[PDB]
Amino acid sequence: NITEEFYQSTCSAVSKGYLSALRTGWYTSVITIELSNIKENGTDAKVKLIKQELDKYKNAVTELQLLMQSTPATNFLGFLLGVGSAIASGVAVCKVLHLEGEVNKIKSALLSTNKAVVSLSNGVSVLTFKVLDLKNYIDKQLLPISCSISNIETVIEFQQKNNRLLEITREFSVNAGVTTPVSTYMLTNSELLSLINDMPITNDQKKLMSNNVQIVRQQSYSIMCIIKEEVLAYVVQLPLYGVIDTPCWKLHTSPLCTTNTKEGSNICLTRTDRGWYCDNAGSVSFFPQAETCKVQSNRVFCDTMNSLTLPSEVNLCNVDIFNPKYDCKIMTSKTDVSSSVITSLGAIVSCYGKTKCTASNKNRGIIKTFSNGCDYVSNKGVDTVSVGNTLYYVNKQEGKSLYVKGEPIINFYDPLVFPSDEFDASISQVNEKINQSLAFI
Amino acid sequence: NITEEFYQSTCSAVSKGYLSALRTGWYTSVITIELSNIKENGTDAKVKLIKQELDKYKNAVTELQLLMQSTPATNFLGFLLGVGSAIASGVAVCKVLHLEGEVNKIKSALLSTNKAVVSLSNGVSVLTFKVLDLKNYIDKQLLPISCSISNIETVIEFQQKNNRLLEITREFSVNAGVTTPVSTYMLTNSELLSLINDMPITNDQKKLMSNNVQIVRQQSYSIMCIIKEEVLAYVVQLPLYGVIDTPCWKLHTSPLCTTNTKEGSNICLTRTDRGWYCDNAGSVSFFPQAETCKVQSNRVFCDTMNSLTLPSEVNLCNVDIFNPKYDCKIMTSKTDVSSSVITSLGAIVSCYGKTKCTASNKNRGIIKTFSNGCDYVSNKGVDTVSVGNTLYYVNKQEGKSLYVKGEPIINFYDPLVFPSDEFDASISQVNEKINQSLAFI
Amino acid sequence: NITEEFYQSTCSAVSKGYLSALRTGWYTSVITIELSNIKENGTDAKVKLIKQELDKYKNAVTELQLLMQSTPATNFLGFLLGVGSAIASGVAVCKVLHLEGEVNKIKSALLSTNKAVVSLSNGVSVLTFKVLDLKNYIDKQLLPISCSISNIETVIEFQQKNNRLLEITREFSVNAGVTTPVSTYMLTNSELLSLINDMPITNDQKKLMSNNVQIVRQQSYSIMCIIKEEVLAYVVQLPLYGVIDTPCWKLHTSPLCTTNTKEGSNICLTRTDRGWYCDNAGSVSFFPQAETCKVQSNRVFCDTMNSLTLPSEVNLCNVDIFNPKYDCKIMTSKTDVSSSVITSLGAIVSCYGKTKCTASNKNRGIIKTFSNGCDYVSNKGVDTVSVGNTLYYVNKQEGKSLYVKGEPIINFYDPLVFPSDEFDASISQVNEKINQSLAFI
């Protein structure tokens, strides 16, 4: 049940009714591919193709080890975020895989099975998985072949069993050994689902991760790890969703300006706290770059690494931007340029100057003509909005919007003492500089 | 015919002579792949490869339907842009494809042909296309085979007919069901050209889209839609070029500073209205992030979603930044750091402090040494420019440049009342704060 | 040997002990694929697959020539950077490849060999390489076949020799003819190593490029060039590392604020000169967007195109932000929001207001609770840090950190005349505006 409210006073709008799925942690699993260690050794069509396909395989392994000479690594209010190192946990697991006893502990565990939990040197209890077993395939098939007795049906199956290794080597070659999203060459869809189900989390988390496999992939890393003792290992680091099903809402803001006819005499004001907001642990997790969050249906997947933690009182700026409990961030300027923001259920139109702004329908064209100022229209009955030479399609998801009539707060400011060009400001910072210019006049 | 003009007064330069191709709208087509619906059912080399290849095919379909549990969705002056939702129109078409009568209307239309126009439930008249027909290939070939009579020539063709489905499933698995650019696994080059030619637009638009297929791809989305009644459907959303062949020009700006020898006593000023500009409908479409526009030869492909609509008088800032009709956006600072901007036909050099700035040639090395200030050099006779430890190659496209001698407007400002650290400012906003500090002294 | 120092006075930290590898230039090589020029010409299983595979090949060539109708092109303090055009040098080489005598000079040189140096029309002496030779493979095999005598072993090898051409055509189709990173479909790992070794540079540069092939790929471009006289040519533009093994260090900064209990009465200050720093030619190459630099082990790969050149005295801001030789860039605000930055060897915590900030260990959970202010913890003994609802993993690379006790310089400022909302400012710019408000009171 999605709903929306537009605040004419502050030229902003909130879509609510969403449910959270915030990545709060990481699970590191160790994916392995058992490798054949052969020295190369007549000519004809069918195993000259095999000699070709295997040189592809040895080259894949020698470029992987060449690739692993160094430890793996990777590269409005968004500037306020901290700075994490996404794969630090995965790199930590991969580091202990280099210790002597460690590589063969894993080799041992998956001799009898393909999925097993291993508790490693430093206490980490990871899930390991053997996804391809080239070594016995090669040993028990290719190795037997003095070099000429074979048939084309095996050339083809060798090409297919090997192709996955070739394509993994590939991804890592153009990614300096860290890929994201994680592909099914790293982890097939059934391999991932199975790893998810074997992951010791709640069954709620299992159902959620299983129902949005495409999202789990986009939020995972595949870290190229080690090649040692005929086992190829790379860590797949998967999201932990520690916050599930808390309320979420998306705040859209657009510039609110005066509309005087003498151009350049106008003052503008924009709320800068736009982004995604989700209740989380008694505070509000705020995501200023609303493009980092993936939305599926009414579920919002976000990464706390890209969040600020705010008092829940931040929600007060939507009904009363002048509330005494929280100082609402705004920016100011004199640049009154037209534009529109396409909300979940409608469109905010900031129309200024000589700009043409309309909203139209599929069959009839124009049904509303916005006059100067900041206005809003619901996506019921409206298919497109135009501001200047820019046509915007509105989202056609169903849900009810609500227009909250109020006086534009830009009117409360005297233009001759209004501080223009303020960015990371707030209602109270603007008032304090107004009182200082008013005293000195 | 490309030309360039450098304005020494404002340390900026304009390349002109380009032609526009602005994406103004979207065309939504429905691409379909007919699927075989079989229950799986002796062992030997050749159809154990077929049993392998088909399990790949059923897994491809079940992960696609698993993927489609939720409705599809996706993620100086650039901050001034509005906010669209790129695939809103495609998602709207895909939504009506879920209605009962809709899926089989398409199934019906392409029983006799591969390309057909269908008018859908809500009045949308889309082009639909059947690009692969696995169902009859499987039914009329694989289905007949008690499970062992076959030959290797069919294993291979099955692998190839199926591979496209495997690779489409693929793209959608790492992209949460929306890909861009659109690949020829989604739409082969001949499929796209044919869809373009069958698209009811002008023949001018057809020739343009046909001559820049690589660009159309980068500006399209492929939206994974529905799997229902043995038909796999995904919407391909293509650009509409409503503005073609209007004048375009690119504005390059660099910081203009005073050059006093006591370091820190300098004041700088930078025009912030850099980007692409194209005449469009009596206004000027302005693109502040000049990297969103693709340029092929002298044609500029841009997306109005990333544009502001400005009065054509914005062009006045290039000959007279002090003109009374338009208030030209500048930023100010005291940070005089050296740098260079590589224009279409030359290079702007902002050289300040103790920085070394030169321009060299292939055979002779250095031919010009820039002194402190803001200067420019044409790409005729010059192959590289160096500012500090940074070597810049200049573009070698041919065209004539013109050096417009003028006094650097930074000289007109008194440093003791100059407002530093202003960003979204203008000539008139800077003057109004100068008059206020001058009154209070 | 990595070390780190945290300056409590300015809430920042420097990791040092790294070695540079700065891309200073470009080497342009010409990669070629000899093509067969055939007119197409009974039906059965095995060469209906060949007629299929070859139509894939002719379509690949006609879409490549269609693609080449236009000349190739491509798209805190980071705003201070200049603006280069990355592929200008490659495009210049590709342009002279269109001149009449040029294409056949290359055709000539590699008739007897696969790798040869050619000196071109304008004096450029490039390395050219023939990586695939479809023409003689087709001519001496496929051409002989009236259209039915063949066997499946050749269908398969044709599919494999051709696949590389198909996949190159591919990359260029979704990239408008310029790809980066460069793949081994463009340049196999042994082809690249060999091209690197045949490149006339120092053996130091050869060893470095050979030991980080994955990095060279990420820093290279593949520019689709020309199809003319049965030769397909695309330029691969590779990095030149003119600066090697100079000291590097990474500066991390976080906001430093007062901690008064009346919320909103606080003033903050953040050093804005964070990024990578490497000694280079007597100045310091400064990289403000620290994500453009790839780090392998203790080697830092960077691109001078994304650098500023600063006086080496910029290093003075780390021991004495008030030093008289260099004016240290800071920003100011009143927005005291909590966050943490994860350094190479520890974590900076800026904890303000009612935020919970801790640092924990694998086995014991919480071991430190940060109080309001800006603090730091080393990664020895600590595995994670939490600030609000955000969990950060710290890097587990080994190295020693050093905590430099000092008084937070935010205390030296009187809050009633502190200029908030300054961004591109400096210690001296802040003091000069303080003296102006203090005079007028």
Ligand SMILES: NCc1ccc2c(c1)nc(CN1C(=O)C3(CC3)c3ccc(F)cc31)n2CCCC(F)(F)F
């Ligand atoms: N502590 C006060 C403070 C905080 C942040 C500030 C600032 C002052 N001034 C700027 C410069 N600025 C911009 O970047 C934009 C978004 C385009 C803009 C819009 C209007 C405006 F008035 C200024 C700005 N920023 C942001 C730097 C962001 C970067 F670091 F990521 F670049």
